[PDB]
Symmetry: C2
Subunit: 349 residues, 2 copies
């Protein structure tokens, strides 16, 4: 048998962590042993586990559907006490509400060279800097000062972010993290308070331990083509604008093409910036802001949403552009931090 008694709210919280991530694959395992209960589920490519300490009346395990169970505890009265028992039929009891679910036994349920730690907030920032740009490149750069670097690119468009690497990294290889795994991790980092994250990397998998939670993912098969090939080296013209004034301005003019005319034209003059979106079926838009520009006037266009993601992820009051012509990729960075760097393909305007 198996029998445990849990606080409803503490159990509902513990359950939303595994909520997001084949009859056995829609279920979730509950293992009760040694004064702590561990919830666990997997999609073969990922695995999330959350454990909370509770007094356990009898030890055992069962595999039960996941979304249904989340929905039951959602409706169970707050702060109530739930009793979970077996006698492939699991019983739930909260007051006179007595459920009985169809289950599956645990038996049907499925070396780390590197190990170091990083704050959860610092971790999520690096992913948010790259998530909006296959996978993200996880490697170290040997620059006298080790820099842990993430790189995401799409042919020529690219996003790269660097940070001072912590102890235990030396010797870590270069691995590719699935985009599926990144999203589930930033969801996991959004739903917890800041803390320490233990990153352990094996031959095939990488694991993130955040206290109660442990997330695990397979890795991508392949090699990354030295992304430095797509980054421009000598972009002569330098342009500076207020980041918040710029985001808002880009936000306004792109409304006259909610559709495929997401392109916006940047007319660049000395210390001035005119923005131009046109739509033959909708009309024209215009805005102007003050810029720090002393190069040859340029007219170049970009995608509206790809800008607001980059600007959404930059942090200084000022935005920096390293440009060439209307056809060459731009280089976008902050004015105070060379931690992150972006490369954006121009579009025809």
């Amino acid at each position: 048998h198996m029998r445990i008694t849990v606080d409803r709210s503490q159990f509902f919280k513990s359950l939303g962590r595994v909520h997001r991530v084949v009859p056995i694959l829609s279920n979730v395992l509950i293992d009760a042993e040694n004064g702590s209960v561990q919830l666990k589920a997997t999609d073969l490519d990922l695995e999330v586990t959350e454990s909370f300490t509770v007094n356990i009346e009898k030890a055992g395990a069962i595999t039960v559907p996941a979304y249904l169970l989340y929905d039951i505890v959602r409706k169970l009265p707050d702060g109530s006490e739930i009793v979970l028992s077996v006698d492939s039929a699991m019983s739930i009891v909260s007051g006179c509400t007595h459920f009985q679910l169809q289950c599956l036994p645990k038996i049907d349920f499925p070396q780390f060279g590197c190990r170091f730690f990083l704050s959860a907030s610092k971790l999520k920032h690096l992913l948010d800097c790259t998530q909006f740009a296959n996978g993200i490149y996880f490697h170290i750069v040997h620059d006298d000062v080790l820099k842990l670097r993430l790189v995401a690119t799409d042919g020529h468009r690219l996003a790269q972010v660097d940070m001072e690497a912590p102890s235990g990294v030396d010797g870590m290889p270069g691995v590719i993290i699935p985009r599926k795994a990144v999203g589930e991790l930033q969801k996991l980092l959004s739903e917890e308070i800041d803390g320490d994250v233990c990153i352990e990397l094996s031959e095939t998998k990488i694991r993130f331990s955040l206290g109660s939670v442990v997330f695990t993912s397979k890795l991508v098969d392949g090699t990354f083509p030295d992304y430095q090939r797509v980054i421009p080296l000598g972009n002569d013209r330098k342009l500076i604008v207020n980041r918040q004034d710029f985001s808002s301005a880009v936000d306004r003019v792109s409304t006259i093409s909610n559709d495929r005319g997401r392109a916006v034209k940047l007319t660049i003059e000395h210390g001035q910036l005119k923005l131009v979106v046109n739509n033959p079926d909708s009309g024209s838009a215009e805005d102007q802001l003050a810029a720090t520009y002393t190069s040859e006037p340029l007219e170049i266009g970009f995608n509206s949403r790809y800008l607001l993601d980059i600007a959404g992820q930059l942090s200084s009051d000022e935005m920096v552009f390293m440009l060439s012509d209307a056809v060459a990729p731009a280089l976008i960075r902050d004015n105070n931090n060379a931690e992150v760097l972006y490369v954006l393909m121009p579009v025809r305007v």
Copy 2:
């Protein structure tokens, strides 16, 4: 040719009221636009899907009077993103409109007003709260029948039914109703109307009904709708007459208990003397069980209903107690409050 300066937020609010009616999927280009008529110190927005029309007016200091028709979703999405509390300047020089907010400048493709489409025997008034109350009781149950019953005391009554499943709500009739007939209001108009009353303060609503149309003026807003062609059946045939067994339960304990067991759509109610067990079954998922306190002294009954229809009825009933008028497991149930102004009829299901 026209020039006005409006507060953005007050204009965004004024714009969300008529926002919904515009048919985004419409093919004719003027039907996706919205008319703005500027005259006599107030700005009136108006739009239609041929079947409905909303107009809303707000007072503005007006530099120049004139009119133009501008696409709606484009403009709604634009004004949403403009900084709050700002002032917007809207200009013509037809089918060419200029917008100015700071250094932002738009120029939209429009159509002149002349291209926009254009007697009420009955007229009476109703409190805004009481009106929305009558529809929320009915919305979840084509159209709904609008009529009065002459019961020595006139009773303004709303009826919506699905064969035997039915919803009826009565109210003391106001001045000016005598002579108003019975009309059917499209379900399209009801939903759009319940939204308009959620976004306005309580007040008095002027209902004007003609031979073919009915109009609702709620202060700033003016809503008008076509009526349905057809016949409504004589719903008194549908309401059960002699349901012997009567059962009373706590409304919120009942909703919550039904909500909890319905997580696993029919639920079986085993009714005994002073006892009520709730049971949902699922061969592919399993079973649920609950028990609640009931006021039952009739012959024990086992009868089932749809889970979602209960939570709407209990969601719309208002006393602590819910009442059921039953016969056997196959005869329709009658649910009432204890203020019996409204009543529901639900077909049972096999459980």
